[PDB]
Amino acid sequence: AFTCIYKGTSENDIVVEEWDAIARGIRFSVIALEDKEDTTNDRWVEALSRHTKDLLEIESYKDNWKKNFIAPCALWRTTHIENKRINYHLI
Amino acid sequence: INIDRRRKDIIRTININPTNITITSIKKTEIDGAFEETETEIKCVVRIFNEKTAEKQISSEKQGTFSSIRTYGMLVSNDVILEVNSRDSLEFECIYGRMKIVNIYPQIVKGELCGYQCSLERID
């Protein structure tokens, strides 16, 4: 499966006289062709996607978009990670 | 060649297969850096003939679509002076598309005009 996203329309509305026709080009796109798993080793992302699914009753994709996403949906990627040793025993 | 021989030939040739015509002349005159058009009309008996085996061109675009062909020539006597420039045009209503006098070849003998040989676009 997959899910097309409407992006726009061709440059102008062209007339093609030899074919005796009028044409217009609608422009779609598809997301995340390669991704085929919908799973993550980021435990935090898994936890928050589960929380969003339970709270909200919609699909929740974990690491990145998947091509067959079912709108309405949510995504919970991680963008930045910082680690600190705040103590001898604590991180 | 004598002038009278050419006159007889052209008048006879026109009279074998004549067609009455209403050439409408639209002359552009420069006025303050732009054109002012004065439309005038004339009538001439004329013979129309095929001069070229050309092919029909079609020019379709957002301004419009029109198709012309350069096949038809035309022959007209000395009765009326004709002139076609970049700034002047001569056209008329043939039932099968409007004709347009692209070019005028004046048949002159010893500096005396005796008739025009002509070429047309039949603008569909």
From TrEMBL, chain A:
This protein is called Uncharacterized protein
Q: What is the lineage of its organism?
A: Bacteria, Bacillati, Bacillota, Clostridia, Peptostreptococcales
Domain of life of the native organism: Bacteria
Species this protein is from: Clostridioides difficile (Peptoclostridium difficile)
UniProtKB/TrEMBL annotation, chain B:
Protein name in the entry: Uncharacterized protein
